[PDB]
């Protein structure tokens, strides 16, 4: 029948949310991606509203954890059983962290019988041998040995991350089942047009210790994921031409390629932080063919 | 045309605290004044009160810190979410995303030094009922666990986690000196036999025995949707229907007023029992004197 028109939310870069961590977006970055594998499992959705990988709709439940917790005796560590069918054809529980690193946050527990509440500094290492979210359990190191009760509802809320810039590695996927392979992964992403690179929506993660690599790049904003999921407009071409427009003056600053699979590319060469007006937004104009040459932007 | 997004209750986010919604509640509201300043938005996409669009930037705090010597407390001067200054000339009650209730909010204060990349994080709390809680003047105070670590002229973020609270009592945005200004109006059922419909979450607790119930008038996703679509209200009331997608059967109906709140036909407190896959659906525009069928 008649096609539903395609659209992108009218929002500036600083009004949208990063889809790989529950923080706002900060800038637009571009750089070569051949030296590393870009395969995030969050913020993955096709343009017609089909979620991929471990991507869901709620922007708060990113890198969060929920369940019941058992103390590892002799340590300040605790094991959380996740609340989960391992049979769903997904790489890991929805919202699982899709990068290797040490995430700091708060473990909060509630005791049902009377309403007691508890909170403690927790950390989870996604590259740890005891990080098996696909199997239904993860490990947190806390600051207590007796405070968290058994089989009480416990929530992990993330905050940030803990040789300089050797951690966290954002382009290295965790092993969801352990050390002895991942399944149902979203495809890796690379620009298949000469002179084109990926355009990353970049945020700065909060740091809690040391000298961490606080850059976090996502292919699609969370608001874009929610919008694509809602509208479910079919892709009439393989790539959709988006133009960055100034709403006051109407001047176009640059144009980009929005691929139907769910990533953006620009015509540039080299690492570059895009300088844009604070009120600029992305506007959809047309569906372009496979031979479309983007006008390059400095 | 007008519409509401096809989402279940448990898939949406509370607009007064960055946490997922949990249930639907309804009850009498005569014994308290319902005037929240977050999660307020007209149906044609006009934000009211201290409401903005980011669902993660609710109850957060950004700026620079100064140490109160002899204590573990700190004083943060506020910057807008774009890292610009908070301009108190803005005809808003307080910086957008400000907590709109009295209580102690626990969280983490994180700081980064620009030159070398040193980072620190510390347990912090902010009391919205305190004398030094004056966001409208561009200043808040934080109770920390350190007296030495946080530096000056360095960007600092406060991310909330939970409470240690009077949910329906607004803070004094400029302190105990002045009154609050440009408040979103209080809502109440103006039709006989009707009650308000609250989207209810349970706030995390980190100490003590706090009352963790938090009700919002609109889910944050509804606010984003209304702001994006900008559909003009053709009537005083928008008739919504909660529908089970498996069978198509209507569970109940409710009235979405153009100012931004929902009412149901009920009498007495009740936590609504709903199917997990149900969603709200817009059907038509009806007048204010439309009698809803009783809600189970």
């Amino acid at each position: 029948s008649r096609t539903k028109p395609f659209s992108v939310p009218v929002l500036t870069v600083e009004e949208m949310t990063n889809s790989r961590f529950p923080i706002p977006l900060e800038k637009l970055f571009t750089g070569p991606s051949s030296a590393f594998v870009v395969q995030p499992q969050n913020g993955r959705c096709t343009t017609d509203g089909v979620l991929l990988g471990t991507t869901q709709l709620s922007p708060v439940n990113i890198c969060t954890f929920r369940g019941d917790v058992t103390h590892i005796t002799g340590s300040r560590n605790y094991t959380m059983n996740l609340a989960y069918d391992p049979t769903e054809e997904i790489p890991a529980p929805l919202g699982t962290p899709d990068f290797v690193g040490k995430i700091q946050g708060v473990l909060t527990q509630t005791t049902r019988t009377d309403g007691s509440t508890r909170g403690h500094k927790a950390t989870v290492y996604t590259g740890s041998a005891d990080f098996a979210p696909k199997l239904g359990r993860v490990q947190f190191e806390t600051d207590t040995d007796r405070d968290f009760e058994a089989n009480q509802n416990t929530k992990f809320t993330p905050v940030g991350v803990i040789t300089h810039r050797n951690e966290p590695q954002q382009w290295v996927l965790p092993s969801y089942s352990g050390r002895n392979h991942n399944v149902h992964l979203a495809p890796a992403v690379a620009p298949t047009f000469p002179g084109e690179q990926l355009l990353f929506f970049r945020s700065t993660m909060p740091g809690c210790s040391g000298y961490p690599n606080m850059d976090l790049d996502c292919l699609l904003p969370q608001e874009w994921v929610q919008y694509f999921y809602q509208e479910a407009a079919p892709a009439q071409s393989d790539v959709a031409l988006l133009r960055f427009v100034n709403p006051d003056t109407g001047r176009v600053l640059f144009e980009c390629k929005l691929h139907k699979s769910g990533y953006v590319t620009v015509a540039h060469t080299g690492q570059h932080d895009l300088v844009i007006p604070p009120n600029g937004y992305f506007r959809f104009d047309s569906w372009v063919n496979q031979f479309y040459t983007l006008a390059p932007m400095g | 045309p007008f519409s509401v997004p096809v989402l279940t209750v448990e898939e949406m986010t509370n607009s007064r605290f960055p946490i997922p919604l949990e249930k639907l509640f309804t009850g009498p509201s005569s014994a308290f004044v319902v005037q929240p300043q977050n999660g307020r938005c007209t149906t044609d996409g006009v934000l009211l009160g201290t409401t903005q669009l980011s669902p993660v930037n609710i109850c957060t705090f950004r700026g620079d810190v100064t140490h109160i010597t002899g204590s573990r407390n700190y004083t943060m001067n506020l910057a807008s979410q774009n890292w610009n200054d908070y301009d108190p000339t803005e005809e808003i009650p307080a910086p957008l995303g400000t907590p709109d209730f009295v209580g102690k909010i626990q969280g983490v204060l994180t700081q980064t030094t620009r030159t070398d990349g040193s980072t620190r994080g510390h347990k912090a709390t902010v009391y919205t009922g305190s004398a030094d809680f004056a966001p409208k003047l561009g200043r808040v105070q934080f109770e920390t666990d350190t007296d030495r670590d946080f530096e000056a002229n360095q960007n600092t973020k406060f991310t909330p986690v939970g409470v240690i609270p009077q949910q329906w009592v607004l803070p004094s945005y400029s302190g105990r000196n002045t009154h609050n200004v440009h408040l979103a109006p209080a809502v109440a059922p103006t039709f006989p036999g009707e009650q308000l419909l609250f989207f209810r979450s349970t706030m995390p607790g980190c100490s003590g025995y706090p009352n963790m119930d938090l009700d919002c008038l609109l889910p944050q996703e509804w606010v984003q949707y209304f702001y994006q679509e900008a559909a003009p209200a053709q009537s005083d009331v928008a008739l919504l229907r909660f529908v089970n997608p498996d069978t198509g059967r209507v569970l109940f109906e409710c009235k979405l007023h153009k100012s931004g709140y929902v009412t149901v036909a009920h009498t007495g407190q009740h936590d609504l029992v709903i199917p997990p896959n149900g969603y709200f659906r817009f059907d038509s525009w009806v007048n204010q004197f439309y009698t809803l069928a009783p809600m189970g």
Epitope: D48, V50, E89, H184 | -
Partner: nanobody, 114 residues
Framework: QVKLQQSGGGLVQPGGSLRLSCAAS????????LGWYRQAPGNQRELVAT???????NYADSVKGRFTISRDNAKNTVYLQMNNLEPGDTAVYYC??????????????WGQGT
């Protein structure tokens, strides 16, 4: 968003055999569940057989043993081999695709029916 094309129906008499085919058209091939259901006179829709991308099959107790579902993920095409067809099997047969989108709440996508 997703189109479905059925073929291979018809009518046999007791002891006969048939084979149904359903080809899917997606802009990007997804991980989905593809299956066959059937609807009888004055009777509601019931399951015949479903198959996933990984290969998990679920058969209805009525057709368990006689009917066989098969899948080709490269072509996104599902097949249903019906052997020992008996009068209790005369119905309209629908092909269905269910993936991780909004339409999943409402049952997914459907074919014409035979």
């Amino acid at each position: 968003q997703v189109k479905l094309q059925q073929s291979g129906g018809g009518l046999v008499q007791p002891g006969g055999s048939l084979r149904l085919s359903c080809a899917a058209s997606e802009s990007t091939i997804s991980i989905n569940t593809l299956g066959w259901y059937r609807q009888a006179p004055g009777n509601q829709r019931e399951l015949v057989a479903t198959i996933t991308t990984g290969g998990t099959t679920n058969y209805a107790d009525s057709v368990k043993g006689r009917f066989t579902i098969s899948r080709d993920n490269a072509k996104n095409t599902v097949y249903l081999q019906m052997n020992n067809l008996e009068p209790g099997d005369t119905a309209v047969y629908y092909c269905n695709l269910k993936r991780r989108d909004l339409q999943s709440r409402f049952g997914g996508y459907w074919g014409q029916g035979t």
